């Protein structure tokens, strides 16, 4: 319990970006999930359609996938990396993903640890 729940996830996401293991969006979030190559699912609490949410929950229920629920999709735009940056490092493109599906992990000693702990507390 060194790192936090809403801090260690960034590392997981960053490693996934590095190692080409991010199934973001809607169709890539779904079609890779049923292909049992995808391990985790992250969902936006801020939503327009509950049917989508239901579908997600079904997906998570079937292949025993752990569900993480983050407040807003617009916040997750910073977490995923769907922002175009300036020379200094300023975002000018504001697009936020509602579903972040994790395919691959980087072999981590802290993030993977904290996250594992969280998981084992949950289930």
């Amino acid at each position: 319990g060194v790192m936090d729940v809403n801090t260690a996830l960034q590392e997981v996401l960053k490693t996934a970006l590095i190692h080409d293991g991010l199934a973001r969006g809607i169709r890539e979030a779904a079609k890779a999930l049923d292909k049992r190559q995808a391990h985790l699912c992250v969902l936006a609490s801020n939503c327009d359609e509950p049917m989508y949410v239901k579908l997600v929950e079904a997906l998570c229920a079937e292949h025993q996938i752990n569900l993480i629920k983050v407040d807003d999709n617009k916040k997750l735009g910073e977490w995923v990396g769907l922002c175009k940056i300036d020379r200094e490092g300023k975002p000018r493109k504001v697009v936020g993903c509602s579903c972040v599906v994790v395919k691959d992990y980087g072999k981590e000693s802290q993030a993977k640890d904290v996250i594992e702990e969280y998981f084992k507390c949950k289930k």
């Binding site: 079609k31 292909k35 049917m51 989508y52 239901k54």
Partner: protein
């Protein structure tokens, strides 16, 4: 050097043909039950590479995958 005038003339190319935007097509694939069971409406393609995830289109008579070009009756 002797400069050219540059002529006006207005012809509208503003009207140009763009294909229709289909909004939120993911819900058409699956019907989720009240309990939480997933039911697939469309046929899933059993091809060499595009299996487990890639669906086939519902033609008026047949089925058609959109990656490998597989056709049926």
């Amino acid at each position: 050097a002797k400069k050219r005038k540059k002529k006006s003339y207005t012809t509208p190319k503003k009207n140009k043909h763009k294909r229709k935007k289909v909004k939120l097509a993911v819900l058409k694939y699956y019907k989720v039950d009240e309990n939480g069971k997933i039911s697939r409406l469309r046929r899933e393609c059993p091809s060499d590479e595009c299996g487990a995830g890639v669906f086939m289109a519902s033609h008026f008579d047949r089925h058609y995958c959109g990656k490998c070009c597989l056709t049926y009756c």
